[PDB]
Design an enzyme around this catalytic site. Structure first.
Site, PDB file in Angstrom:
ATOM      1  CG  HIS A  18       9.805   5.664  -6.446  1.00  0.00           C
ATOM      2  ND1 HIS A  18       8.593   6.268  -6.713  1.00  0.00           N
ATOM      3  CD2 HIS A  18      10.058   4.846  -7.497  1.00  0.00           C
ATOM      4  CE1 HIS A  18       8.149   5.855  -7.886  1.00  0.00           C
ATOM      5  NE2 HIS A  18       9.013   4.985  -8.379  1.00  0.00           N
TER       6      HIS A  18
ATOM      7  N   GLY B 163       8.927   3.053 -15.130  1.00  0.00           N
ATOM      8  CA  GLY B 163       9.543   3.922 -16.110  1.00  0.00           C
ATOM      9  C   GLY B 163       8.760   5.210 -16.327  1.00  0.00           C
TER      10      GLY B 163
ATOM     11  CB  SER C  98       8.325   6.098 -11.432  1.00  0.00           C
ATOM     12  OG  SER C  98       7.567   4.943 -11.109  1.00  0.00           O
ATOM     13  N   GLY C  99       7.648   9.322 -11.492  1.00  0.00           N
ATOM     14  CA  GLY C  99       8.146  10.682 -11.421  1.00  0.00           C
ATOM     15  C   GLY C  99       7.451  11.612 -12.404  1.00  0.00           C
TER      16      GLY C  99
HETATM   17  N1  LIG Z   1       0.421   0.912 -12.058  1.00  0.00           N
HETATM   18  C1  LIG Z   1       1.084   1.968 -11.852  1.00  0.00           C
HETATM   19  N2  LIG Z   1       0.515   3.166 -11.976  1.00  0.00           N
HETATM   20  C2  LIG Z   1       2.529   1.875 -11.474  1.00  0.00           C
HETATM   21  C3  LIG Z   1       3.334   3.013 -11.482  1.00  0.00           C
HETATM   22  C4  LIG Z   1       4.682   2.915 -11.147  1.00  0.00           C
HETATM   23  C5  LIG Z   1       5.218   1.671 -10.787  1.00  0.00           C
HETATM   24  C6  LIG Z   1       4.404   0.544 -10.757  1.00  0.00           C
HETATM   25  C7  LIG Z   1       4.936  -0.801 -10.412  1.00  0.00           C
HETATM   26  N3  LIG Z   1       5.260  -1.727 -11.347  1.00  0.00           N
HETATM   27  O1  LIG Z   1       5.671  -2.818 -10.687  1.00  0.00           O
HETATM   28  C8  LIG Z   1       5.652  -2.725  -9.317  1.00  0.00           C
HETATM   29  C9  LIG Z   1       5.174  -1.442  -9.078  1.00  0.00           C
HETATM   30  C10 LIG Z   1       4.931  -0.783  -7.747  1.00  0.00           C
HETATM   31  O2  LIG Z   1       4.823   0.437  -7.672  1.00  0.00           O
HETATM   32  N4  LIG Z   1       4.861  -1.588  -6.679  1.00  0.00           N
HETATM   33  C11 LIG Z   1       4.528  -1.155  -5.426  1.00  0.00           C
HETATM   34  C12 LIG Z   1       3.404  -1.650  -4.758  1.00  0.00           C
HETATM   35  C13 LIG Z   1       3.094  -1.203  -3.469  1.00  0.00           C
HETATM   36  C14 LIG Z   1       3.917  -0.285  -2.820  1.00  0.00           C
HETATM   37  C15 LIG Z   1       3.570   0.203  -1.448  1.00  0.00           C
HETATM   38  C16 LIG Z   1       2.572   1.184  -1.378  1.00  0.00           C
HETATM   39  C17 LIG Z   1       2.161   1.717  -0.157  1.00  0.00           C
HETATM   40  C18 LIG Z   1       2.751   1.256   1.012  1.00  0.00           C
HETATM   41  C19 LIG Z   1       3.737   0.277   0.948  1.00  0.00           C
HETATM   42  C20 LIG Z   1       4.162  -0.260  -0.268  1.00  0.00           C
HETATM   43  S1  LIG Z   1       5.323  -1.373  -0.197  1.00  0.00           S
HETATM   44  N5  LIG Z   1       6.758  -0.697  -0.406  1.00  0.00           N
HETATM   45  O3  LIG Z   1       5.282  -1.917   1.128  1.00  0.00           O
HETATM   46  O4  LIG Z   1       5.127  -2.416  -1.167  1.00  0.00           O
HETATM   47  C21 LIG Z   1       5.042   0.202  -3.478  1.00  0.00           C
HETATM   48  C22 LIG Z   1       5.350  -0.240  -4.766  1.00  0.00           C
HETATM   49  C23 LIG Z   1       3.062   0.642 -11.115  1.00  0.00           C
END
Ligand SMILES: N=C(N)c1cccc(-c2nocc2C(=O)Nc2ccc(-c3ccccc3S(N)(=O)=O)cc2)c1
Ligand SMILES: [Ca+2]
Ligand SMILES: [Cl-]
Length: 223
Positions: free
Chosen positions: A40, A175, A177-178
């Site tokens: 991502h 930030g 991430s990765g």
């Molecule tokens: N807390 C952390 N370790 C972290 C790390 C990186 C980014 C963030 C973050 N900081 O702010 C938001 C964030 C975020 O990642 N939001 C998020 C929530 C759920 C999904 C997700 C997970 C599995 C399936 C589907 C989804 S989704 N794309 O439908 O939402 C994806 C991203 C938090």
């Protein structure tokens, strides 16, 4: 990193910063020419910054090398976040030294309970915004799969694991991430996602690297 601490310059010599005019993701150096990061975090024209501590000052020990290839996992799904892994080839091999070193891939998966090191230059606040100059660190345990799934409002796939603290306050964040999750000297995780940062009963979710070792080796060998 929220609720972590200042690593100390170059104490995490495999930690790299992905830069596009600014820092936007971490990554982990796995040999002189390859970086593991998150799918991502994909962006074209990535510059890899190695040997960094203070990302806003040229201190020495830095190496800036352009990405020559960014290989997102073919089965990466931006919805489900499954297979959140990307391999970056550097245009030039990095000069490896005490401050720029590779981290080993795992030979077997990490086990729940093991405390791991997580690092990055991401947000240090759980609400609001503060980005550090220097590399931040967090030691956090891998959590069981069942508590992970009980905590998460989203589906946890067999390619993800939870690590961190359910009482809130300590987590990776935007930030980071990765970036790396290293357990017993092995790269076991990649900072992938989480529901906000450092919220109660909402631990960080990480790409499960041990599932990708054969894929990583094969891809690297054919590129
Ligand atoms: N807390 C952390 N370790 C972290 C790390 C990186 C980014 C963030 C973050 N900081 O702010 C938001 C964030 C975020 O990642 N939001 C998020 C929530 C759920 C999904 C997700 C997970 C599995 C399936 C589907 C989804 S989704 N794309 O439908 O939402 C994806 C991203 C938090
Ligand atoms: Ca610097
Ligand atoms: Cl700082």
């Amino acid at each position: 990193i929220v609720g972590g601490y200042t690593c100390g310059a170059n104490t995490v010599p495999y930690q790299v910063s992905l830069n596009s005019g600014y820092h936007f993701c971490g990554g982990s150096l796995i040999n002189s020419q390859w970086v593991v990061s998150a799918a991502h975090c994909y962006k074209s024209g990535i510059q890899v910054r190695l040997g960094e501590d203070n990302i806003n000052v040229v201190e020495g020990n830095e190496q800036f090398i352009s990405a020559s290839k960014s290989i997102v996992h073919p089965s990466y799904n931006s919805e489900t976040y499954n297979n959140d892994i990307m391999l970056i080839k550097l245009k030039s091999a990095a000069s490896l030294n005490s401050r720029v070193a590779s981290i080993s891939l795992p030979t077997s998966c990490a086990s729940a309970g093991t405390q791991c090191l997580i690092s990055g230059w991401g947000n240090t606040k759980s609400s609001g915004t503060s980005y550090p100059d220097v590399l931040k660190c967090l030691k956090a345990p891998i959590l069981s799969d069942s508590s992970c799934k009980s905590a998460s409002s989203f589906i946890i796939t067999s390619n993800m694991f939870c690590a961190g603290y359910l009482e809130g306050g300590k987590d990776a964040c935007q930030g980071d991430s990765g970036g790396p999750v290293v357990c017993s000297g092995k790269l076991q995780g990649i900072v992938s996602w989480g529901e906000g940062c450092a919220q109660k009963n909402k631990p960080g979710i990480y790409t499960k690297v041990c599932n990708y070792v054969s894929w990583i080796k094969q891809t690297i060998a054919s590129n």
